[PDB]
Amino acid sequence: NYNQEDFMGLDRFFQDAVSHNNTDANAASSIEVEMYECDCMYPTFAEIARRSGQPEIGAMFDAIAKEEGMHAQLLTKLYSELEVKDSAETLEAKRLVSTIESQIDAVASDSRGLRRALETALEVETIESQKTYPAFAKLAAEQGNMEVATAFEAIVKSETKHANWVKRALENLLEVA
Ligand SMILES: [Fe+3]
Ligand SMILES: [Fe+3]
């Protein structure tokens, strides 16, 4: 059962935090992904938006990026000593970032570049808000880590808001008049 892969592999920018038995390790994985989104993924989407002639959508992605760093920093405050390193999958994503950056004028000139960037943002925001962070919050609570559970609950709310922002932006982008 073969499906075509997305235009320029843009879907592979989405990175999911990894599930563990221990809430520290879920936190470490979250920090890693949220900082990748803050540092790498959303800034690249922002530049695709600007180069596409969509500076308002670019500003949205810059605003979201800052918030991803807030999520990371909330967790790092709770886990002051944790040493976060990029996994093989994050490193591969950062390589894809760099290859798209090198081709950024071609990606932006095609209407699909920004469309797929917004659809990929929607994909992560949906998975993180509806699946990954609820599961981390639930496990934190089960383990008696109330402060971390409450942090994950706040990140769930925030990622939900990002999903809504991204859907309204996508609805805009596509509607010409
Ligand atoms: Fe995120
Ligand atoms: Fe988000």
Side-chain angles (χ1 to χ4, degrees), residues 15 30 33-35 37-38 41-42 64 67-69 71-72 124-125 128-129 133 155 158-159 162:
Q15 295 294 307
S30 175
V33 169
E34 299 276 289
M35 288 312 304
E37 293 172 341
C38 173
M41 192 193 74
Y42 276 124
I64 295 170
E67 292 190 354
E68 304 305 331
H71 304 159
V124 300
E125 297 294 351
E128 301 316 282
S129 67
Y133 291 127
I155 296 166
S158 183
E159 304 290 41
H162 295 169

Side-chain angles (χ1 to χ4, degrees), residues 21-146 148-151:
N21 65 292
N22 38 330
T23 294
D24 51 324
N26 290 342
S29 185
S30 175
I31 295 155
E32 174 191 348
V33 169
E34 299 276 289
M35 288 312 304
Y36 156 78
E37 293 172 341
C38 173
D39 296 344
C40 310
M41 192 193 74
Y42 276 124
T44 300
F45 289 175
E47 192 61 20
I48 297 172
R50 285 184 275 270
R51 298 267 201 124
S52 302
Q54 299 285 341
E56 183 162 358
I57 294 169
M60 176 196 73
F61 282 139
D62 288 333
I64 295 170
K66 286 181 160 272
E67 292 190 354
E68 304 305 331
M70 298 175 197
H71 304 159
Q73 295 188 99
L74 172 56
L75 297 170
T76 295
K77 182 164 173 133
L78 292 169
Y79 285 101
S80 66
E81 313 305 298
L82 247 185
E83 196 181 342
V84 178
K85 301 180 188 188
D86 288 343
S87 67
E89 294 73 20
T90 297
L91 293 170
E92 170 60 10
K94 290 180 178 190
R95 280 200 295 284
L96 181 64
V97 162
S98 66
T99 73
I100 290 301
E101 284 291 345
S102 284
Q103 301 177 70
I104 202 157
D105 295 315
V107 168
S109 69
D110 192 302
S111 282
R112 292 171 293 183
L114 182 56
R115 289 180 176 200
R116 299 297 173 277
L118 282 160
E119 294 160 352
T120 301
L122 180 53
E123 175 196 6
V124 300
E125 297 294 351
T126 297
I127 291 165
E128 301 316 282
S129 67
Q130 303 294 323
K131 289 282 283 171
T132 305
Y133 291 127
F136 290 178
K138 180 180 170 188
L139 185 62
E142 190 228 326
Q143 298 181 338
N145 199 333
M146 301 200 301
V148 176
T150 295

